[PDB]
Symmetry: D2
């Protein structure tokens, strides 16, 4: 069964129980590109609903929207915000129209769910109207970007939790491996001694910078253009409505929002999206570097560095034991490369704004929510399926530190530069340790245990 609806282009038959309407139906036909629909990015659906609740409350309080229609609309928004009706948001994320299809998907679905609450039938738009009532005082160009900013704010906690979790895992391994002496490597050449613990604490340290800079950057989104309507001149939406709507949207979302400084600027500026993507791009670059180290430090088992052992999560051959593919970090690098790619997409999109509008905010929101979700899962998997279970190869780390030619420097104040250089040269020609060569020159072994102690070199005063 179907019902019959009408827009400024004509009539169509919508399936009887669909909560979306004619406008959404056309957009499903117009933008069939990715098979990724609005409900694949639920945070934006929840956000549109909160913005639509805020406006309805504001209109009601200013006596522009009748009580029964406010009650019905609010109850409908509440349903969507608590995650009902998600399957009704069917529009492709790659939609044209600068956000209009998302706005209309929300307008129609809220309208019809509102009607259900009033005991009227779907499609009875004379009672609750998708444009006249649910979109009162509003514009795609202020509702959509406001919800976009809201959705990024709402999905902030998933990436913060993930960072904290990865931080906590590196800290623990930094503590566990505190006295595990090894050789540091610069340009991939053996340099001077360091512990495995300082090295893991430094992975921890780098990500502590990230959670701070991300928080700082997210705060730019608290600035909203709600009330500027179409191009920032705020025509058709009163000052009092804008004031009230923002106060309401703060209450609903639990986030203190404010009006942006210049709404004509805010109508078109995507600069904040570039900045936010940049910090996701930074996390991915840094994160990728960590994943690379864990791949390098565990290379082997016999003909690599073999200094750490990652947990074997992948099945192997009984006749090929010891082969441990660094499979979680690999999965992490792929997330990072993708995050970097998506970041360029945001850049091209941001760059292509014209006059009073950027038309490509839907592509932007899709890439940022994607990068955020992917990065959260990569970091969570890295922490629990890999980092938590890493083991030090204690003897083989020590071997590297003990084999360092750099230890010969500690002999200068005892035998003179010329002769310490000789030992250095000899140790390298013959392949023995500085310790072994030093012994042959009649220097005492228990004295050398002190002089050439690598843990002493790694830990400054």
């Amino acid at each position: 069964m179907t019902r019959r609806e009408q827009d400024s282009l004509g009539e169509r038959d919508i399936p009887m129980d669909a909560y979306f309407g004619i406008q959404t139906l056309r957009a499903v036909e117009n933008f069939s590109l990715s098979d990724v629909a609005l409900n694949h990015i639920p945070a934006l659906v929840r956000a549109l609903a909160m913005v639509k609740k805020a406006a309805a409350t504001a209109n009601y309080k200013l006596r522009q929207l009748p009580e029964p229609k406010y009650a019905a609309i609010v109850a409908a928004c509440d349903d969507i915000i608590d995650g009902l009706l998600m399957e009704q948001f069917v529009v492709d994320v790659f939609q044209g129209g600068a956000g209009t299809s998302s706005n209309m998907n929300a307008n129609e679905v809220i309208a019809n769910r509102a009607l259900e609450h009033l005991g009227r039938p779907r499609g009875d738009y004379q009672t609750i109207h998708p444009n006249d009532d649910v979109n009162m005082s509003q514009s795609t160009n202020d509702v959509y970007p406001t919800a976009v900013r809201l959705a990024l704010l709402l999905s902030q906690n998933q990436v913060q939790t993930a960072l904290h979790r990865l931080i906590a895992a590196f800290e623990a391994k930094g503590r566990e491996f505190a006295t595990v002496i090894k050789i540091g490597r610069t340009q991939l050449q053996d340099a001077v001694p360091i512990t495995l613990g300082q090295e893991f604490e430094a992975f921890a340290a780098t990500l502590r910078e990230d959670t701070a800079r991300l928080e700082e950057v997210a705060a730019l989104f608290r600035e909203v253009n709600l009330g500027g309507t179409a191009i920032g001149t705020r025509i058709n939406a009163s000052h009092a409505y804008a004031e009230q709507a923002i106060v309401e949207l703060s209450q609903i979302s639990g986030i203190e929002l404010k009006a942006t400084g210049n709404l004509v600027e805010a109508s078109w500026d995507t600069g904040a999206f570039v900045t936010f993507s940049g910090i996701l791009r930074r996390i991915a670059v840094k994160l990728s570097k960590i994943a690379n180290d864990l791949r390098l430090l565990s290379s082997g088992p016999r003909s690599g560095l073999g200094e750490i052992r990652l947990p074997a999560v992948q099945p192997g051959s009984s006749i090929m034991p010891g082969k441990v593919n660094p499979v979680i970090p690999e999965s992490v690098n792929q997330v990072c490369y993708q995050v970097i790619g998506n970041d360029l997409t945001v850049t091209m999109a941001a760059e292509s704004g014209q006059l009073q509008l950027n038309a490509f905010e839907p592509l932007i929101v899709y890439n940022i929510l994607s990068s955020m979700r992917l990065l959260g899962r990569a970091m969570t998997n890295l922490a629990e399926r890999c980092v938590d279970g890493i083991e030090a190869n204690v003897e083989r780390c020590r071997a590297g530190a003990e084999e360092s030619i750099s230890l010969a420097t500690a002999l200068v104040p005892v035998v003179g530069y010329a002769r310490a250089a000789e030992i250095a040269k000899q140790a390298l020609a013959s392949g023995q340790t500085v310790m072994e060569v030093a012994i042959s020159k009649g220097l005492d072994a228990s004295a050398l245990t002190i002089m050439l102690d690598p843990l002493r070199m790694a830990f400054p005063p």
Copy 2:
């Protein structure tokens, strides 16, 4: 209800109904990252099955695999090639493992479907073994990349068909607007006359270069490393098996494949993916510019260029008639920006190869298969729902042409550059036409109506 399987890491309970095994089950746990499973890229599944059919056949012909197992493996691969069992390919496209997870997902499903065709229950690997039988004479590092290449080859037609569709839309609007004179624009300044038809056929002409460049580049994927195994040294696979498996994979896929020249180089080289991601990027860059020209030319209705009118696919406000948001092109632009980024993701991945292998082909194949699909759909919509129904504002077009001070350009071959420049400046300074200004200086009214016809200036 579950069944009990064993791998190198130990024992695990697998759902009764599942054709995948303990190795796939583990990879599903290890790489839960995106929610996009292998089944979202079915051409690679289809391709993986094709390779498994070919390998099985070549092992049977060299008497390495006995007949009853051969007949059962092949039957199972056929079922996969025919679109059955797709829901069993459950591994995340962002998998670590350089392909092993996709490879093992095929091994386990093939073995359990092969077991079923042969009477026996899921997990009786003593009979059909995922590793020892289905993966016989193979390594992830040769079967997976070959599947990757075959999956790209088989996806050519969706993009070629869409390019051919868009070309035909433009060609037709080219003929429809052959005499619709308008003004050209360089650097957004008014230039010399041209027809809308010429503009449109130009769009079709650039997408013709693209269909050819695409064939040429897709052709590199015909070269496969099947039988190089782990690192290119051919260990565990005979020369005889390699040639035979290629002959067989050629017959099965409908495409003439050949052995690549250096299996050692081939084991790790990802330049073929960069090249092909590159033409997709070209198509994106070209297609996005066309979309942009469509948005500019349809700007208005009254304070834009207003030279064309796209079909109104999006309903507008009853109080704001004449607003047509160039919504299909916008959607295309956005597809184009996603393809460009995807091309960088392939770049990052491709550059990060180490020694005998590149560990990130899962990412590469996923990004290229996506961009191919999005370009196909974007071009097919652009053609069917925008171009086919575009209409010219004939009088606004004409008006930009006759108005133009550029009409003096056509007097350079008459009175030399200098005197013609002089005529141009006098018209602009005195508010007279170039026609008006030129009779002034003694030239025949008769010859000028012809010489300064803007439609004449558009053609040789």
Copy 3:
């Protein structure tokens, strides 16, 4: 005429009148790639010299360096700081060795200039040694990334001065065009009325956001790893030395520096370069939109939007008087594209770090200093040679606002949606203003002149 120098690889002949040494000579031969030498980023040379002055002073105060040597080194450093000896930094910016070549170019030059401020010959390194004395307590790995941070910090001003300059240009125009009413455009479709002044003050507005983010990001460079030596374990340099050197470098540079929190992390973290490069990327993205807006609003003279007119800085085609190519925004566009490519370069280099070091700080620092210098010049040019002389086309702007259909919304509470939608459709259908159609239906002329005033609509 040459002199004879030795390093661990052997003996070489160095030009007699060179302040550089055998290690710089070797570097010149090793990385001849680009024809762009260290002196082409002088801010890094000055910075290297400041840090060397900081190290010598701290070394002096802690009694690791004797007073005669301290004072010669310090005086050499001052010469470089003052702009002398720039022709002696000859090493390619594309150098390998992760800083070493730049550090040794500094060390040798400073040693040799110290030798004359002390009356000794060039090359007499038993008296002033480039490694033992000028690099004392130091490694490339902490000296070089500290110089980079300082260089970037000392170049902040130029991009700040240029931003403020362009802000002021736009603000000034913002006042001038306050009442110049025109139609807004969304998706290139006629929207609602706005003033050219508002549009221009929004340009200013966005750039003021950029000045604050740039400042805020620059501050991250204030944290230095100086003292951390080779890998961040402080080997060969004491706590007191590091504390003292950071105090002394803060005095020398004029910027309050502080020791970074974790020196092991600092040894390899290139993240701050990514964040910063991101703000340049952002500026470029915003800047290119603005440029694009200026090229669009000036399109014409006859058949574009014709809303503004940019000063003519190139001479025109005389066969087309009144054609003005937007030559200055194009040049800015090209700069913005470069900065964005440049940003990807940094992104690769940052990602490529291995274990205790990232080897690619020289490529990172070169690209950033380029980008900064480029944006600084671009924005100055856009302010002085374009924005300041922009003229508004008052009548063409006004006609766009009056001919708009958005006007018909003002009539909804006068005559009702229904009848006001009809006025909109008849206006479009007949080619008349909302005003002319509204006058037909009998509505009062003097109420309509206020009602459908576009200037009124522009301001809440």
Copy 4:
């Protein structure tokens, strides 16, 4: 001492000295952005003068350019083609104008040099006009992109020569290390045996691919729009003029050039540049991974892979012997990252085309010519200064192979899977070779020497 010139914006004073005139002088002031002038990309300056000469010659042959002025213009183009007058090309490569400023620099300089050949004074434009004569039958939008295509064709040789050189260095090391057995590595895990020579021969094979792809992509540039003028309509250039100019440009340059199929399309289409940039990018991507492989194989000396030794080109300290920074690969990598960014710069300029013209070819040509030049020099330096001198650390290579657990598979036909697997497991636990475990199970040493030969595993029949 100066001279006085005039354009449609007033008068200015130009150095008596100079061959450029008033228009070039304004361009110097208007576009001061980089300090990189036209003389930094001489290939373009030369190509412009080739096109200029072709057009003069064509005009002369159709009786539109007087013989004396033809002779003088041609002698001037000849001087520029032969490398004279380079310092008169002073405009910034970052020019606005879509190439007009480069075209006018060519026009003016040629005019003044032609005048000198007639013994006339500088700026006597009544005799030789930069627009009227030197620019006859031409527009910027056909001459400049033609000059650009030909600048890239003139330049192709340096990158092709560099590629062949690098190829040659790899092939020779391929031969020299033909029997240096080592362990192959997949995901940084020990895999199966392979020879170092095979590894180096793979480098050669992959760069051979690049020469073929570069050649075939460069051939797209042979298609030129000379004679399409402003927008592809050909106004002001006769069919005959165009036919003759192309025949003539082909003769001057030594390259079979042909008119492009659709001059309207060709007026704006930047697709050929993207494709050329892309194969440079692809060279960067592969070159970079070779550089990385080199830095990794040479890692150590003692706590890395240490399979090869790169020539020490950078000096070290006498107390720290054995430390060899992989300094030339590092500079290759850096170049590769630059080219990859330059490819993004091109992609931006290309996407930015509008209607009948793309305005950003000056930036495009500059980036591609830079990229080509860097790639050439990096590849040349890698060959002469690193590869040609690489050494194998032969015993360490052989130890990697013997330490490999993959050897146990050879034992299957001999002792059954179960026992073969048991040996592999025991070798892994004790850090012993498969050979050592095998001996201790009472298998014969001279038998096992044959069975477990790594060199047989590296080389198929």
